[PDB]
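Hi W., the 2-acetamido-2-deoxy-beta-D-glucopyranose complex you wanted:
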Amino acid sequence: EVQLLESGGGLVQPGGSLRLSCAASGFSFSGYALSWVRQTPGKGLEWVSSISGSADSTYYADSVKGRFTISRDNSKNTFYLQMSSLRADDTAIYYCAKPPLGSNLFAVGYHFDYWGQGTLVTV
Amino acid sequence: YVLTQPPSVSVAPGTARVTCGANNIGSESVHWYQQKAGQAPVLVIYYDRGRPSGIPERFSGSNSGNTATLTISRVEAGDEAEYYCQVWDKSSDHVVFGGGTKL
Amino acid sequence: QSYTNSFTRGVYYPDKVFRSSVLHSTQDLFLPFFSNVTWFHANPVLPFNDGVYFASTEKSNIIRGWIFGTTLDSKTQSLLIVNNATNVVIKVCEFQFCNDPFVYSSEYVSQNLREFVFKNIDGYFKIYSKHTPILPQGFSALEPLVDLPIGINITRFQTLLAAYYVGYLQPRTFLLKYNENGTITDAVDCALDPLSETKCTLKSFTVEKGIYQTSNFRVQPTESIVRFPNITNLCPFDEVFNATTFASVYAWNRKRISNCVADYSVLYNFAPFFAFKCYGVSPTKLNDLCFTNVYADSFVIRGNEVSQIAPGQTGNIADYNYKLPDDFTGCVIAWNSNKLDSTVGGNYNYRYRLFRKSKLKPFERDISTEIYQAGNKPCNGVAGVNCYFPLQSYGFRPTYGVGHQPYRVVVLSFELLHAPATVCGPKKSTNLVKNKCVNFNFNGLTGTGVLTESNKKFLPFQQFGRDIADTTDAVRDPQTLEILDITPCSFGGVSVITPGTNTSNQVAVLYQGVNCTEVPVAIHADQLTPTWRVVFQTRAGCLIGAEYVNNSYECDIPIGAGICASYQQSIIAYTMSLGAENSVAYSNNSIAIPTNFTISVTTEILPVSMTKTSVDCTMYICGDSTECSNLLLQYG
Amino acid sequence: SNKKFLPFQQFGRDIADTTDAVRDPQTLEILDITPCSFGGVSVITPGTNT
Amino acid sequence: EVSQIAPGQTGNIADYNYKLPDDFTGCVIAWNSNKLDSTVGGNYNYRYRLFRKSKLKPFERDISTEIYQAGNKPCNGVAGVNCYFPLQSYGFRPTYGVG
Amino acid sequence: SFCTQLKRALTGIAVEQDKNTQEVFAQVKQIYKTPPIKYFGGFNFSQILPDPSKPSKRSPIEDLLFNKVTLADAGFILICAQKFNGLTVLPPLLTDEMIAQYTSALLAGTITSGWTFGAGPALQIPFPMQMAYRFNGIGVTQNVLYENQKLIANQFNSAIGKIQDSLSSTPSALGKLQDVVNHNAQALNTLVKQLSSKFGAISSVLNDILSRLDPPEAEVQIDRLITGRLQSLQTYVTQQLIRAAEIRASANLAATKMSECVLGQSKRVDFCGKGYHLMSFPQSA
Amino acid sequence: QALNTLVKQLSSKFGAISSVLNDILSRLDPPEAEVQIDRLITGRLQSLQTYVTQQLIRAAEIRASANLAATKMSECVLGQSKRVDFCGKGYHLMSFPQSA
Amino acid sequence: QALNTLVKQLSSKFGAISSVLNDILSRLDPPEAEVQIDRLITGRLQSLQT
Ligand SMILES: *[C@@H]1O[C@H](CO[C@@H]2O[C@@H](C)[C@@H](O)[C@@H](O)[C@@H]2O)[C@@H](O[C@@H]2O[C@H](CO)[C@@H](O[C@@H]3O[C@H](CO)[C@@H](O)[C@H](O)[C@@H]3O)[C@H](O)[C@H]2NC(C)=O)[C@H](O)[C@H]1NC(C)=O
Ligand SMILES: *[C@@H]1O[C@H](CO)[C@@H](O[C@@H]2O[C@H](CO)[C@@H](O)[C@H](O)[C@H]2NC(C)=O)[C@H](O)[C@H]1NC(C)=O
Ligand SMILES: *[C@@H]1O[C@H](CO)[C@@H](O[C@@H]2O[C@H](CO)[C@@H](O)[C@H](O)[C@H]2NC(C)=O)[C@H](O)[C@H]1NC(C)=O
Ligand SMILES: *[C@@H]1O[C@H](CO)[C@@H](O)[C@H](O)[C@H]1NC(C)=O
Ligand SMILES: *[C@@H]1O[C@H](CO)[C@@H](O)[C@H](O)[C@H]1NC(C)=O
Ligand SMILES: *[C@@H]1O[C@H](CO)[C@@H](O)[C@H](O)[C@H]1NC(C)=O
Ligand SMILES: *[C@@H]1O[C@H](CO)[C@@H](O)[C@H](O)[C@H]1NC(C)=O
Ligand SMILES: *[C@@H]1O[C@H](CO)[C@@H](O)[C@H](O)[C@H]1NC(C)=O
Ligand SMILES: *[C@@H]1O[C@H](CO)[C@@H](O)[C@H](O)[C@H]1NC(C)=O
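Structure:
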């Protein structure tokens, strides 16, 4: 079965830096465009970032553009979100999300069929 | 692109309706996720009416005109959760989520 | 900057053809009827989308001309029209325009309401003009003024000085009326409203009372999706075309090509062949298709034998060396190889079969070297009289002519989509959008429709399903391997109900055989056709624009299923009444005897004969054409 | 021709999309084109036996 | 590429250099000029457009020399990775074949 | 304008169908009603009079006839393939309920007034007297009927029952209407099937030609396909016109029979039955 | 309308380069001209075929109507008809013909 | 007369090189033969339709 595991979340000072890692298994890692989506406790979901399967294109939300950087290692079936200059509003639960086959490209039909357990990050 | 959802919805047990409103949303693919208390979101509807395997047949979807509707017929006690509508903005390449509706 | 209604302004003669007392329709860039026209009062530059309509109303010589181009700067060519009290000057130069000109700091040269129309198409800049004393609600056509052969790229423009009207033309179909003078006096915009569509369909400016079928509404696709197998390897076409040596035609070499992405456009780099020769397919479209398997057959022949590599050919090469099927689908690429396959004294390495007992079937190879028995005496495996070696050497020499020089031939055989495709073009796939009217491309199979999850029990070897009309109604996705039903997008016939143009311009629209909740409510002209937009449900369909009433009258305009429409200030719909209510007072012993009578005279009209028509074929089909008459004599 | 051709017009077409009026390239005058005299012919005979 | 000078054709020359309309009315005359346009070592004066954002409309000319952005990273007017010069030289030589 | 002509011919046929129905059935301007008491001198009419219990208000005979003929398409909101390929069925202007109402009005008029309502105002008359009238018309005196009224009524009731039983039990009794429906359905199915023909082209699918060939060769193949499909449509429209002419002749005959056998007593031999015509009762189909 | 449609059909190209035979003969050599003229001939022959077929059907309908008119002249004008609704609404007394 | 006309229509070329299928099959290769036979088939099918 497809399995996603988040790690690296914790406590960080305001204006600092942190790195989240999501390890993936059960699917062809190089062919799926993965996403990071955060949710503030008591609020709704908010998409953070996305990276393509070939890592040739990265996409960031306007609220986190420049501050965050997405990357992936296909040889390790992992992908990372390195954030810096974290604001107080960045405290949230982060999930690494995988699209299903047939909608694995960051395009019109992009959506998520599986979600990770998530990690809480407090700024 | 902005998705509009009611803050909350209430219905008697054993016909719940959730609406996601946007301008010209009928031309956009709308996906519905369900998130329980302290649990990761679970996809319940894709492509405005597609139901994944294992999801109860109570959930149904539609998308027309200026609104997308998620209908839960014969709502049970375990169906009380937060429902989110999600699209992919073609004009900006942004994954847009809904405001959120709790029932 | 204000906004106003253009009324029925913006009309020009679409050709140089004199026409009189006629109703002519055409398709061109026309200013829409009742169009959102911007009224500028006098400074950014305005755009040039598909032409411009310009209108001036000022009594003073204030508006002096116009500037056209793309960037209004000396990097590109820009077009400048100026007028003064005695002359008009048109010029095309790389002007460095000022941002508020009234002109420049630093090719082509040409010497009351005022309407102009500027078009830039087919390498021509056409200017139409008209002057009409007093936007007015009247109708007047714009005669052509000038045609500049400049062929300049135009995307932006601005006036040169004070109010003026600007509108943007759109590709529209117009029905113009030519009077006895030959002057356009009236026009109908076919897409303005259902009444105008009815007028265009009937080819008349007046519509009688009734119901008319004009067109059919059809939901337009929202996205375009592409589904190709996930293949990353590149096909080794260089190993075939750039081979050091080629096999003989009697032992032609076959290379299997599969599980790779084929970019045929690079083939021209591999060999110096002049052009392709494809059968059942075009070399232009090869990058857009998929194939189950590709076969590359390489050999060397003579120049005069190149024509033998084709379906339906016979001859030594075709009969005994290499045969193509009659239904062959693929390409043949032959190029001269005199510098590589010819040597001084004769290159005898290349051989061809000269004798064989029977003709080869398509795609058959014969490498046997047994002695051929021409006569009846057995050869016993020894060459001699009437017993020759089946293989004859070409003996290519550099001094030979083009017909005798060696030619390297590669035949690409394509297997069409019946099994999973393994050879595909460089086309990139997209996401699999479901439940929406989209344009889909499945392994080269292009179509438009809605893709839904299919319940059809496809067997593992099956890849698509076909309906009665031999069209693909179900398809297997090359990547997810799931079955999808294809349904044509929402559509249906549209009827227009009118009480007659002599009575009112109000109309009702009946979508035939369409549920009232299924009527399209798209707010964009690109998402639904026709572009015009306009509620009761009948068994005949959805009626919009007519108010249903509980009263019953005689049928005026038959809608169908017992429903009729009439004009009573507004159009109403009702159930037609069969007749007046009556009840005969029957009894066991009661009779009714008439005490009066009436002499009634009624009229019955019966047609007896029709018009006797004579037709001469020679005049109708040919009309004093001897060649046409001679060709027509062959039809019996 | 009495047709009031506009200066930019060079020929006129009838219902059958055939040229029925033309402007001379040199004299710039309008000329109507009418097909030459023609007509169907019927033969009345009492019979070759008579 | 001579076959590309015809109505309904695609390819580098047809897409980005010279496009004929579908209803084109006229003639095309092509003749070999190896003795006049080929030199020993390569004649690099003749160039053709290799990359363009969109296909040309019929009878359209594009003499722009701006850097083509193949990928998503802007080139900033500098040629490099995924940013190539739009014009490629033919490099005709007398030893080349007829094609 | 080949397709303009085809559409015009099809619209003419569609209008002519409603015209034929109106000519056959809409012969009276008054919707006569039977009296509440269903006694007509011992003549049972329950099998032909409308049944208030049924929602359609159809007589048992009309209900059996409706059940005996199955319509391929009623025109209301293989058939999917026809619709997807531009072929649709338009509903008739007069519903089955309205035709049944017209038939019931004709029945009430001919039962309560004889032939008087067909030539003017409806004049009430006892039914045995009317049947004596029709006996006079065939050359039989009134006393023959008045001395055998019970026997005549019993024979009429038995004949009506036998007619109902025969229509219920005959394997092919409504063959004409079923043949018309089957002919229309077969013509539509053949028109749909003709789209699979290549007509000398490389493929019968336009998308395949457009994807495999350049616009010139694609235009050639599409021209061949267009010629083939236009010929198919031409043939379909011609056969439909011929069938419509035949149906119009049949409907004119039916209207003449309704006027001369239902609205009156016909002296013509074999026009309204085998023996000497007494009367006739219409039933909607 | 049938005659007008037959005339209008001469403006159709039927896949040819032009709808005018003279244009084809002046723009193309005799082989290609023969091809285009064959296409035009096929189109115009199809138009004439359709016109003749529709004329035959209309003539059959008109002949049926004329047979009915002759029957009505024989049975309502030359005599008194007992047939119901054949020569009027009420009981037929007589009938008078008038040319149209 | 209808039957005789149907028989006589077989002598028409309908734009083909010959009205005999054997002549076309013996004088032309299968592609050009298919073209000519398609023309003949169209003509004869039109005759049968009429
Ligand atoms: C499309 O397919 C490519 C190529 O995969 C190859 O071809 C396919 C048709 C199948 O036959 C595959 O089995 C075959 O490998 C996929 O990219 C490839 O994904 C695989 C994972 O399934 C990667 O293999 C891994 O590579 C690493 C080294 O980096 C090893 O540690 C692992 O043990 C394992 O071998 C492979 O590297 C990768 N190749 C490339 C070029 O990216 C691709 O995922 C697939 N697309 C989808 C959407 O499924
Ligand atoms: C029968 O009907 C006729 C109708 O034609 C009656 O004639 C009319 O009688 C009235 C009253 O006397 C006059 O005012 C009219 O001028 C008469 N009309 C004509 C055309 O002459 C006639 O009186 C009625 N007879 C009976 C016995 O009721
Ligand atoms: C007229 O005929 C009907 C049926 O043809 C008779 O109705 C039947 O009545 C009997 C006894 O009352 C019932 O058992 C049957 O079931 C009835 N048949 C139907 C079809 O309903 C009716 O009685 C007859 N009329 C008269 C006046 O006797
Ligand atoms: C015309 O366009 C303007 C600008 O978009 C808009 O505000 C206005 O409503 C439109 N219609 C009219 C009738 O002015
Ligand atoms: C109008 O412009 C032309 C062209 O520049 C010039 O020759 C002429 O003198 C001008 N006339 C007036 C009245 O300014
Ligand atoms: C046509 O032109 C003549 C001039 O000869 C004019 O009298 C007439 O009014 C014109 N017709 C119309 C409809 O304007
Ligand atoms: C063929 O291969 C040789 C080396 O084997 C290489 O130099 C040459 O460029 C190739 N031919 C082409 C046309 O690329
Ligand atoms: C149209 O749709 C509604 C619900 O979708 C349905 O109840 C109704 O029957 C349909 N209309 C017709 C005429 O069947
Ligand atoms: C008519 O006769 C029948 C049977 O004799 C009877 O039922 C009815 O009451 C009688 N009277 C009337 C006024 O109908």
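The helical segments of chain C are 194-202, 238-241, 267-270, 316-321, 338-341, 617-622, 626-632.

W.
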